[PDB]
Amino acid sequence: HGHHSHGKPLTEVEQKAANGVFDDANVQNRTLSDWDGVWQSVYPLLQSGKLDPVFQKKADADKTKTFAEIKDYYHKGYATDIEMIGIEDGIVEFHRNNETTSCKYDYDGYKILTYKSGKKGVRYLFECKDPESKAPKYIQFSDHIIAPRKSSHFHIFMGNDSQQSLLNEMENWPTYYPYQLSSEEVVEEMMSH
Ligand code: NI
Questions:
Q1: 20 CA to centre of ligand 1 in angstroms
Q2: CATH 3.40.50.300 fits 1-193, yes or no
Q3: How far does the centroid of ligand 1 lie from the alpha carbon of residue 144, in Å?
């Protein structure tokens, strides 16, 4: 200590929401600034073998999967060449093999998704309307939050076809944690929930 936590403790309603249990009437619009900061892809952590304990734990609990099946699922899930994303002043900047593209994204609302389990998630949609940018036309953030609050980590869906295409995406879900975390810290956070 230090001060090891951040930031306000979750209310019971927020903890349920973070776990996919919420009333649609409680979902609110957010702005891009909820994702401000500098963000690291988790994919190299998978590749370095640092996430192997996450996968083994799962393989043990699940009689129907092997470690190899589980790790391959996450390999495809996290795979991206966008090692770092920077968000500031309304602009998303994607770093991809030390090459950057960026756009000042426009917000396009949220979409509430329901799963066969009964649980739900919220996607926050943005669109690039800058004809000079090479950044993806459509992006969506998915994190544990349904109302204005700074994100702890997220999936970001990206493409040039439609928002619906991203709502439907099952196989690839590039995932990002705060850049300043140690790999150990990222693994702890992944493991924590
Ligand atoms: Ni999470």
A1: 11
A2: no
A3: 6
